[PDB]
Ligand binder design. Structure first.
Ligand SMILES: C=CC(=O)NC[C@@]1(C(=O)Nc2cncc3ccccc23)CCOc2ccc(Cl)cc21
Ligand SMILES: [Cl-]
Lengths: 298, 302
């Protein structure tokens, strides 16, 4: 029993965190094999013009108490790739993957190439992440683990005026309509991840909470009209299929659980909580619920 | 900006997790130097758990009865002893990944990270608090016994908790790393129940100071309160009594935001009376009590 916001064990990623300094800017880098990846803003900016004026020795890379020597550099989208003389002996098995909004991942927040914390978060439908970062956190990374393979999906670049965060995949492509430049940028209107709230409702039933269940069902279309009224993401047939295992485990059909969600949106919780929360939680995917309620190890 | 329930990076602890098997029972162990620490109930059967005599069960065991696995390598047990509710297995290899560490016993209200493991393999990390009734609201399944709680301040790992059991309400009970249980709990399958839980007042105040630091002041009011009047109101909502030590501990946060501790207490009294009225504080509709004054300073201020 219990249901917590759980992050993946961070050890495989801790062994890759380095400090990258160029002039007056210091941020974090990801050292995998003989390459260090970091945000290109470490160097209205013209990044080809700023980079062409740099030599290899202008980049100071620190791995613990050891300086790494930069032997080459190149830019891929908004990520700077620093070729170093030493391959990281702690390099885990890894992939670079681009995630979709609604997907979750662990973030290892770092300052000066030193990991300070780990938390679980979700890519919001508006492509921002509600993270917890301070100045010097740039270059901190987001990941998932599957078996022994680390899939790197996020690199932190900036904070928006509302306190939320924006970054890229590990190939330097931003998530969302953002640019790596000090200019007026704002997060779009956010929406709730419907498939994730339903998954968390199934997790509450598995942990013995059934007060919100009702005898009713709904059509997908009628549910989608109601959910669009409450700034919830549209629920597709793919979402309904993905919730199949949880529906079969609890005996509550997805559209039956949707009718419970409609009643919660129209009437509230009435002084009650679900898994110790007075709000409907949307940062656990159907897979996170299955993994936590089964004990999958890495 | 932002405020998340943050756990410590778990790598230093992952390198210590091993699998311990005795007969049909398999659980997790903590391998530090040449010793593996694990719950002593690894020597029990299900027909033993009601009234186990651990000294009698242990005296019948030899070193080779304990199978210890570190990854894909079997460790050789060369000695064994019991310290309170922890079994200490001396092994023939010192852990090369042993970090700098301390064993610390924490007080209720203190927080820590838990690395949940199954079969000596880490599956997840989360942040938790020792509740006033000495239980933890964790996320544990069968086979997670031996999972540990820790804090990593500087490069030193302070081990404060080892998981032993789940109580009937779904909450968890365990020991410090010297085998002394937190609370009035025993490692027996006897009828045990957690005492009535209460809210950690000093932690809610710390989280209210964290909200002010992040730019949220809607909940503040023009009132102050005496410590006694605050405790007479707080006890009625099942909040822990706030002591002069708690008021002293909140000093730095009070000085940083300019809000006196007893003025923040008056705001807490009003929140308890009014509720939030559709508003949130740091993305939450409930008053959060699992961040200590120290966690707030660490996260909001670096
Ligand atoms: C051979 C021994 C043994 O398997 N012991 C573990 C046990 C336990 O609580 N386990 C579990 C821990 N954590 C989470 C759980 C979730 C779901 C089921 C079991 C969970 C089970 C029985 O009741 C007791 C009673 C006392 C003690 Cl110390 C331990 C236990
Ligand atoms: Cl303490």
């Amino acid at each position: 029993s219990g249901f917590r916001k759980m992050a993946f064990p961070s050890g495989k990623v801790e062994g890759c965190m380095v400090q990258v300094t160029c002039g007056t800017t210091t941020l974090n880098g990801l050292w995998l094999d003989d390459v260090v990846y970091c945000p290109r803003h470490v160097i209205n900016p013209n990044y080809e013009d700023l980079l062409i004026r740099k030599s290899n020795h202008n980049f100071l890379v620190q791995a613990g108490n050891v300086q790494l020597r930069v032997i080459g550099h190149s830019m891929q989208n908004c990520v700077l790739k620093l070729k170093v003389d030493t391959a990281n002996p702690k390099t885990p098995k890894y992939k670079f993957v681009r995630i979709q909004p609604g997907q979750t991942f662990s973030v290892l927040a770092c300052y000066n190439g030193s990991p300070s914390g780990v938390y679980q978060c979700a890519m919001r439908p508006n492509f921002t992440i509600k993270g917890s970062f301070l100045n010097g956190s740039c270059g901190s990374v987001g990941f998932n683990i599957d078996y022994d393979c680390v899939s790197f999906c996020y690199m932190h670049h900036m904070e928006l005026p509302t306190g939320v965060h924006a970054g890229t995949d590990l190939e330097g492509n931003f998530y969302g309509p953002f640019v790596d430049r000090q200019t007026a940028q704002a997060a779009g209107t956010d929406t709730t991840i419907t498939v994730n709230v339903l998954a968390w409702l199934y997790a509450a039933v598995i942990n013995g909470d059934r007060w919100f269940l009702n005898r009713f069902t709904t059509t997908l279309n009628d549910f989608n009209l109601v959910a669009m009224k409450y700034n919830y993401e549209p629920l597709t047939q793919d979402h309904v299929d993905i919730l199949g295992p949880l529906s079969a485990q609890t005996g509550i059909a997805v559209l039956d659980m949707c009718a419970s969600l409609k009643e919660l949106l129209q009437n509230g919780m009435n002084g009650r909580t679900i898994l110790g929360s007075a709000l409907l939680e949307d940062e656990f995917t159907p897979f996170d619920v299955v993994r936590q309620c089964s004990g999958v190890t890495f």
